[PDB]
Design a binder for this molecule. Sequence first.
Ligand SMILES: Cc1cc(C(=O)Nc2ccncc2)c(C)o1
Length: 330
Amino acid sequence: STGSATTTPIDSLDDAYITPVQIGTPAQTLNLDFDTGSSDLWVFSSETTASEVDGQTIYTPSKSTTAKLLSGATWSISYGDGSSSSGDVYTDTVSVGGLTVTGQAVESAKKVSSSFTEDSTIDGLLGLAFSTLNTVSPTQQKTFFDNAKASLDSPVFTADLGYHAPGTYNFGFIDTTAYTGSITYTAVSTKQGFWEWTSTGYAVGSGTFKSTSIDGIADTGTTLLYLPATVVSAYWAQVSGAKSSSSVGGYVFPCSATLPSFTFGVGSARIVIPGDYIDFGPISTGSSSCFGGIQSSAGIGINIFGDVALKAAFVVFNGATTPTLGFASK
Ligand SMILES: Cc1cc(C(=O)Nc2ccncc2)c(C)o1
């Protein structure tokens, strides 16, 4: 089997992407944030505290003839950005782009943090990291991809995120029309539960490539590119007037600037992020200070190849017995 679904930016900045997902019988379609940095499929629901729901579409398990309470199971998650949610668990039928999994754990939120409430466009998350990170207790549950894997034509999914435009998540096949040149594959460590890999270096604009190992994660659920302070300083030094602002919480730059590209290495291959992808616009409405899309990972504890980086590539998440990651230009 295979599946193919379009993923759409939630706003004009590509802060996140949403993908329609069918849950239950008859189908209830919710727009979920596919997150290769976490491993829980959770949704706003009829159980979510009413004051914490503001415009989201909810899953109502009582209206699904295939929903079953997973008795005694609870979940609770905290993300890197400080957001969180928790609740109980149902199993139900879940379909993405024509690919159906029966008995998928659907984690129903009883509580969500303010950031989730305030984002009316995101009805929940669909985790695509390794199932070892799943938070369900006392019986850990599998991700949608892990459940689907055996049925897929090939044990892979691909992320093809758009810049200010829709893109695609495919399951079970590699669309050879969706990228240019060749896909370069690179080793993955699953030891922390992430799609963790080592970039071979970087360049800023038309500058020379610096060969240096940068360990990090491919994370579709993180907006920005978070890299070591040395690398980030070298980037922003090429932008007149750019500075790190403790009050804003990262690098900002004059909105009148033209940003240089940023290149990262994948083995002997190179992925170029155009300068415009690194512009996240005014820090507040009407401001001439703009927020940068490349930020320091110091204090996070891990480097994160988030959407800024991933959207510049066609990315293969190869879930074979020994997982790997593939990157192609597009
Ligand atoms: C301000 C904000 C952040 C988020 C959000 O979804 N975080 C997040 C971070 C990492 N992985 C998954 C999710 C929301 C709704 O609002």
